Design an enzyme around this catalytic site. Structure first.
Site, short mmCIF file in Angstrom:
data_model
loop_
_atom_site.label_atom_id
_atom_site.label_comp_id
_atom_site.label_asym_id
_atom_site.label_seq_id
_atom_site.Cartn_x
_atom_site.Cartn_y
_atom_site.Cartn_z
N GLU A 11 0.78 -1.20 0.00
CA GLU A 11 0.00 0.00 0.00
C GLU A 11 0.82 1.26 0.00
OE1 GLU A 11 -3.79 -1.97 0.28
OE2 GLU A 11 -3.08 0.04 -0.30
N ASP A 20 -6.40 6.40 -4.93
CA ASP A 20 -5.98 5.04 -5.01
C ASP A 20 -6.04 4.50 -6.45
OD1 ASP A 20 -8.73 2.94 -3.55
OD2 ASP A 20 -8.54 4.02 -5.40
#
EC number: 3.2.1.17
Length: 164
Positions: A11, A20
């Site tokens: 991440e 994202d």
């Protein structure tokens, strides 16, 4: 290696709102804020989450706090889910990390939809499951991350991450 290092690799860490892979407003270590298009809805969710006026930015400490919460929530969610819990209970420690990674990324609901793969993992049919898991939008959209997770299920080792 452990779940936290694993996820930190997948991440990344960002201290300012970001979008994202799917275009959603996120901050820290993969902490989704909102699916809403509004940067403003995002900043609002952010302040609510931190408990301060952040104006889109947070500290390392805040990022890690949120991370602790999310990992904790992922685990508890698995434990409470009737479809996931038996799979988790049947797995060894490394593979357990792999299912946690999937839940953190795609939520409980999403992973619980991988019916057949779940079945294969339960049955310890590593190879077959690796191939089934790859037949997903998940794999097509974030293939390198998907491969790392898949490899983890396949082998039962941290090899895919020892590189990184």
């Amino acid at each position: 290696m452990n779940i936290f290092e694993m996820l930190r690799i997948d991440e990344g860490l960002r201290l300012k709102i970001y979008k994202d892979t799917e275009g959603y407003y996120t901050i820290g270590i993969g902490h989704l804020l909102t699916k809403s298009p509004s940067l403003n809805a995002a900043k609002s969710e952010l302040d609510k989450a931190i408990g301060r006026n952040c104006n889109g930015v947070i500290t390392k400490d805040e990022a890690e706090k949120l991370f602790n919460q999310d990992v904790d929530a992922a685990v508890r969610g698995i434990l409470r889910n009737a479809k996931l819990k038996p799979v988790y209970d049947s797995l060894d420690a490394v593979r357990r990390c792999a299912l946690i990674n999937m839940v953190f990324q795609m939520g409980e609901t999403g992973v619980a939809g991988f019916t057949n793969s779940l079945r294969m993992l339960q049955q310890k049919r590593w190879d077959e499951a690796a191939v089934n898991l790859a037949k997903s939008r998940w794999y097509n959209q974030t293939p390198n991350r998907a491969e790392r997770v898949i490899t983890t299920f396949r082998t039962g080792t941290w090899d895919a991450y020892k590189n990184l």
